[PDB]
Design a protein around this motif. Structure first.
Motif, PDB file in Angstrom:
ATOM      1  N   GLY A   1      33.670  37.450  52.112  1.00  0.00           N
ATOM      2  CA  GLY A   1      34.459  36.567  51.272  1.00  0.00           C
ATOM      3  C   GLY A   1      33.598  35.698  50.376  1.00  0.00           C
ATOM      4  O   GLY A   1      33.980  35.388  49.248  1.00  0.00           O
ATOM      5  N   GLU A   2      32.433  35.302  50.881  1.00  0.00           N
ATOM      6  CA  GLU A   2      31.517  34.461  50.119  1.00  0.00           C
ATOM      7  C   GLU A   2      30.883  35.246  48.973  1.00  0.00           C
ATOM      8  O   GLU A   2      30.711  34.726  47.872  1.00  0.00           O
ATOM      9  N   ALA A   3      30.538  36.501  49.243  1.00  0.00           N
ATOM     10  CA  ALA A   3      29.924  37.358  48.237  1.00  0.00           C
ATOM     11  C   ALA A   3      30.910  37.686  47.121  1.00  0.00           C
ATOM     12  O   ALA A   3      30.525  37.830  45.960  1.00  0.00           O
ATOM     13  N   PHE A   4      32.184  37.806  47.480  1.00  0.00           N
ATOM     14  CA  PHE A   4      33.225  38.119  46.508  1.00  0.00           C
ATOM     15  C   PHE A   4      33.434  36.958  45.540  1.00  0.00           C
ATOM     16  O   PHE A   4      33.550  37.157  44.331  1.00  0.00           O
ATOM     17  N   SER A   5      33.482  35.745  46.082  1.00  0.00           N
ATOM     18  CA  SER A   5      33.681  34.552  45.267  1.00  0.00           C
ATOM     19  C   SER A   5      32.676  34.503  44.121  1.00  0.00           C
ATOM     20  O   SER A   5      33.054  34.414  42.953  1.00  0.00           O
ATOM     21  N   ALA A   6      31.393  34.562  44.463  1.00  0.00           N
ATOM     22  CA  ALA A   6      30.333  34.526  43.464  1.00  0.00           C
ATOM     23  C   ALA A   6      30.471  35.679  42.476  1.00  0.00           C
ATOM     24  O   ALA A   6      30.174  35.534  41.291  1.00  0.00           O
ATOM     25  N   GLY A   7      30.923  36.828  42.973  1.00  0.00           N
ATOM     26  CA  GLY A   7      31.091  37.989  42.120  1.00  0.00           C
ATOM     27  C   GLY A   7      32.193  37.803  41.097  1.00  0.00           C
ATOM     28  O   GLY A   7      32.105  38.313  39.979  1.00  0.00           O
ATOM     29  N   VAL A   8      33.235  37.071  41.478  1.00  0.00           N
ATOM     30  CA  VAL A   8      34.359  36.819  40.585  1.00  0.00           C
ATOM     31  C   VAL A   8      33.896  36.169  39.287  1.00  0.00           C
ATOM     32  O   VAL A   8      34.429  36.449  38.213  1.00  0.00           O
ATOM     33  N   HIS A   9      32.897  35.297  39.393  1.00  0.00           N
ATOM     34  CA  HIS A   9      32.360  34.606  38.225  1.00  0.00           C
ATOM     35  C   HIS A   9      31.740  35.597  37.244  1.00  0.00           C
ATOM     36  O   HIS A   9      31.889  35.459  36.031  1.00  0.00           O
ATOM     37  N   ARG A  10      31.045  36.596  37.779  1.00  0.00           N
ATOM     38  CA  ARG A  10      30.402  37.608  36.950  1.00  0.00           C
ATOM     39  C   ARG A  10      31.442  38.486  36.259  1.00  0.00           C
ATOM     40  O   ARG A  10      31.264  38.888  35.109  1.00  0.00           O
ATOM     41  N   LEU A  11      32.526  38.778  36.968  1.00  0.00           N
ATOM     42  CA  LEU A  11      33.596  39.608  36.422  1.00  0.00           C
ATOM     43  C   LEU A  11      34.309  38.895  35.278  1.00  0.00           C
ATOM     44  O   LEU A  11      34.538  39.478  34.218  1.00  0.00           O
ATOM     45  N   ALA A  12      34.654  37.631  35.498  1.00  0.00           N
ATOM     46  CA  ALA A  12      35.337  36.838  34.484  1.00  0.00           C
ATOM     47  C   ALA A  12      34.485  36.706  33.225  1.00  0.00           C
ATOM     48  O   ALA A  12      34.965  36.930  32.114  1.00  0.00           O
ATOM     49  N   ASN A  13      33.221  36.341  33.408  1.00  0.00           N
ATOM     50  CA  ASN A  13      32.304  36.177  32.286  1.00  0.00           C
ATOM     51  C   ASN A  13      31.586  37.487  31.976  1.00  0.00           C
ATOM     52  O   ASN A  13      30.367  37.586  32.106  1.00  0.00           O
ATOM     53  N   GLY A  14      32.353  38.493  31.563  1.00  0.00           N
ATOM     54  CA  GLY A  14      31.773  39.783  31.239  1.00  0.00           C
ATOM     55  C   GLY A  14      32.686  40.629  30.373  1.00  0.00           C
ATOM     56  O   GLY A  14      32.291  41.081  29.299  1.00  0.00           O
TER      57      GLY A  14
END
Length: 37
Positions: free
Chosen positions: A19-32
């Protein structure tokens, strides 16, 4: 952050880990994909 091989991370908190790894990943997805800048 090599906190072990990974076996201890599973029994420890595989749920909180994923769940922690996904959260940080969401930021990369949004800003891409799209962007007005």
């Amino acid at each position: 952050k090599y906190y072990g091989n990974g076996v201890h991370l599973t029994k420890s908190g595989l749920s909180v880990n994923w769940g922690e790894a996904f959260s940080a990943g969401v930021h990369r997805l949004a800003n891409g994909g799209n962007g007005f800048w």
